[PDB]
RNA sequence: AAGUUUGAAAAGCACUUUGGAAAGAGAGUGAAAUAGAACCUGAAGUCGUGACAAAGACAAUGGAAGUACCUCCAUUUCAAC
RNA sequence: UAGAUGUGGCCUGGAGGUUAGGACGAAGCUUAUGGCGUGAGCCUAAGAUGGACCGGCCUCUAGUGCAGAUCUUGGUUGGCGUAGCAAAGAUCUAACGGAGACGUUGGAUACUGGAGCGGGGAAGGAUUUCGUGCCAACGGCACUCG
RNA sequence: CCCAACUGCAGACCGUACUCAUCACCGCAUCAGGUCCCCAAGCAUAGAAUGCUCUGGUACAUAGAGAAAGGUACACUCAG
RNA sequence: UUAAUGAGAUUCCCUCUGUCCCGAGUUACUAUCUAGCGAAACGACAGUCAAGGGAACGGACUUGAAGGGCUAAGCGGGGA
RNA sequence: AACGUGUCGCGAUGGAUGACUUGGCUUCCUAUUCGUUGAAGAACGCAGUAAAGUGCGAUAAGUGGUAUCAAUUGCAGAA
């Protein structure tokens, strides 16, 4: 039927790992990340999910060059 | 005390399979001291781990 | 505030945690140098002024400077198995009786003393 | 904290516990209360015959649709069982409190089981699986067992 | 089963190492908040799929 | 979801012995272990055993009014109103 | 009853005042602890409770009173040791190990029956492999095994 | 000149354990469900039928004691 | 209108039978008892009847009649 | 009798409450706004002993400079 039986036909993969977003939303067949729109230069970003914007903003990661450059520009250098 | 390892790989040295390797029961510390498929090949050469004959599936009927 | 002080205290770096762990000099070692109190250093002989081990003199073995305590060499404590351990008296409960020299301590000690004189 | 009742003489008494006794509170309840005034030797003699299934544990208060048996008439009932795991688990808690009677210098052949007390522990959890995808609990319900002893002067 | 990219292989190896217990020199540290690892995966319970 | 917020200090129960080891009983630490790491307090709910009126079921509860016995609960008298 | 209104009227959190307690034990908590208020409630005592905060009064303030929302969350409980653990292979023994129904070896009888409880792969899973331990909880029984 | 044959040196990257299922995957789970491919013995027999066997694999799917009623069966017979 | 085909709908006949007259015996597996394990749905309180009245078919009210208690296996009348 | 009650003392479970609060929220304020000179993001790494996290990048739990003084600390090690 359409429950435990049809759950057995779950062989393929719709999504694989996104080289840019690092998560598992890279739709294989039409090759685009379902969560950052890779290979689109702009990452997908929609105001109708501000909560998901917040999971993806700056500072949510390492923020290497900024934790440095924000120190240089706040000390009269650049 | 358990002879699972010495029985698993002696069946992989005799190349027969289980229920064909006969691990001598009257001595296990002899077999248990094997713990290696070269120390078992020596054991096979000695009395302790014979391979029992396969079977007689008659065909005279 | 209450909230920011109990954070700058417990979140204080190590070199800050040493001036927050200063102990008063004895009654006859202050006017020896004319200052009020010093941060405790390893190997500076002291005397406890408060606690179960009060009035017990000893040489500071270490400044265990994240427990917020100093370790005195004669203030020990027994575990269950005989092995003796060292209890940590907060420096403010201690009164320094000895110092350790330095061309950076009897120079800052008269930086504090040049305030008086 | 310890021990609902004090033995009313502490040197003429032994004490023993378990905390996570690993089996049913309800089987362990009557396994324990069945020996609650007996001498220590008459209590092991009970349990060691419950295991040979010649005497039973009269289930009171947690009988609840257990089968009737002939061996429960002495206990004034019709119901009773032979819980092996809860009996072998107090063969051990008693022989502990024996070792506490020798340790103080008390003949265990004089010990009376005063005040057994069984109660409930933290009730471990391991889900099971119902029809239609309903994940129901399958609580384990361990138990604590207390008991102390005493002597009877001639 | 036998085909995994090397990149997908580098990511399960980074998970086989993260699946070790907290060593018993961590819980005697002065003020740690760690008693268990609380990120241990079991291959049956939860899957990584990467 | 999750304050392990034990204690001032890990001083985190050495050691004895019952257990195959856990755990238990002892000791011992400390102001408290009746603060023993699933640790401040520790409630309700439910449960356990000990006691009892040891009562007494023939729904529970409750109302009023008594009585039985029992309550370191209050008060008063305790050569007096 | 719906409703309205009053109360020098009750209560919770906090503020401004005042009065005042507290390691000679505060909040809290317990109750056959009484008393006293018609009541909301307050006060006391006594805790083999608790360990460090807080009461009264006048104003102020509000996230201020709960039994009932197929309320929400957490926890417990009855039914209850009850339904059940009934499709798919029947374990039987020796002597051995072990702290001990368990395991191992031997023998025995079987089952799968070559569209397999076989040997290899893809998809998927990614250490599940192996060995040596281990046996707390997990393997819906148990385990010395996993 | 050009190629072969003979030598000489070198031959790099990734995968590779295990699994592939009544315990490893999906099904919430060690779930009677689902899931692609290869290898395929003997005899009866038209024979990948079905029955039984050699190889290989497996007898840790809870177990025990019994005659209720009632029940469920890839369980039966039943006078006229 | 039609030959063929039909897990289509329908009627009869033949055979055949436990569909039945009318049931009975046997068998596994269960239920039953035990060791181990252990849920849940549901839950105001509950819980013997008749009659009366009543939101007009009451477990509680009224008036009668039974009812000692606690129980195991059943069953399916009621608990609208 | 046992069971079932029922009140009391003591326990267990439970984790409310109170007390605490390096967190939140709100309000205000003082200055300056990343990237092709490769950002943000994520990936994998790095510790004598480190799984996570924090920090860092094969100079990897940091090197340099100054400025400070004697620790770090679970315990090694180390002027
Ligand atoms: Mg494609
Ligand atoms: Mg492009
Ligand atoms: Mg965009
Ligand atoms: Mg408020
Ligand atoms: Mg409100
Ligand atoms: Mg409420
Ligand atoms: Mg309710
Ligand atoms: Mg399956
Ligand atoms: Mg899923
Ligand atoms: Mg065979
Ligand atoms: Mg017939
Ligand atoms: Mg309901
Ligand atoms: Mg009846
Ligand atoms: Mg019945
Ligand atoms: Mg709270
Ligand atoms: Mg900008
Ligand atoms: Mg780069
Ligand atoms: Mg990291």
What's the short story on this structure?
The structure is cut from a larger assembly and holds chains A (78 residues), B (61 residues), C (117 residues), D (154 residues) and E (50 residues). Helices cover 18% and strands 8% of the residues of chain A. Chain A is an alpha+beta fold and 78 residues long.
Distance between the termini of chain D: 33 Å
Number of strands of chain D: 5
From the spread of the alpha carbons, the general shape of chain D counts as: globular
Using CB atoms under 8 Å apart, which protein chain pair has the greatest interface? A-E, 2 and 5 residues
Helix content of chain C: 10-25%
Alpha-carbon distance between the two ends of chain C: 34 Å
Number of helices of chain D: 3
Structural class of chain D: alpha+beta
Give the percentage of residues in beta strands of chain D: 5-15%
Query: Rg of chain C to the nearest angstrom?
Result: 15 Å
Characterize the main sheet of chain D: 3 strands, antiparallel
- Widest beta sheet: strand line-up of chain C: 6-5-4-3-7
Number of E-state strands of chain C: 7
Q: Topology as H/E string of chain D?
A: EHHHEEEE
Helix content of chain D: 25-40%
Radius of gyration of chain D: 17 Å
Oligomer class:
part of a larger assembly
Largest sheet of chain C: 5 strands, antiparallel
Number of continuous helical runs of chain C: 3
Protein described:
This is part of a larger assembly, with chains A (78 residues), B (61 residues), C (117 residues), D (154 residues) and E (50 residues). Chain A has 78 residues and is of the alpha+beta class. Chain A is built from 2 helices and 3 strands. In chain A, strands 1-2-3 form a 3-stranded antiparallel sheet, with no helix packed on it. Chain A starts with 14 loop residues before the first strand and ends in a 6-residue tail after the last helix. Chain B is of the alpha+beta class. Helix content of chain B is 33%, strand content 10%. Chain B has a two-stranded antiparallel ribbon with strand order 1-2. Chain B is elongated. The relative contact order of chain B is 0.23. Chain C is α+β, with helices and mostly antiparallel strands and 117 residues long. Chain C has 3 helices and 7 strands, in the order αβαββββββα. In chain C, the strands form 2 sheets. Chain C has a 5-stranded antiparallel sheet, with no helix packed on it. In chain C, strands 1-2 form a two-stranded antiparallel sheet. Chain C is globular. Chain E contains 1 helix and no strands. The two termini of chain E are 13 Å apart. In chain E, 0% of the residues are buried. Classes of the chains: A alpha+beta (78), B alpha+beta (61), C alpha+beta (117), D alpha+beta (154), E mainly alpha (50). Chains in contact: A-E. Chain A binds chain E through residues 17, 24, and chain E through 7-8, 11, 49-50. The complex binds magnesium ion (MG) (18 copies). Residues 28-29 of chain A line the site of one magnesium ion. Chain D binds 5 RNA strands through strand 1, helix 1, helix 3, strand 2 and strand 3. Chain B: This is 60S ribosomal protein L19, putative. Chain B: Belongs to the eukaryotic ribosomal protein eL19 family. Chain B: It comes from Leishmania donovani.
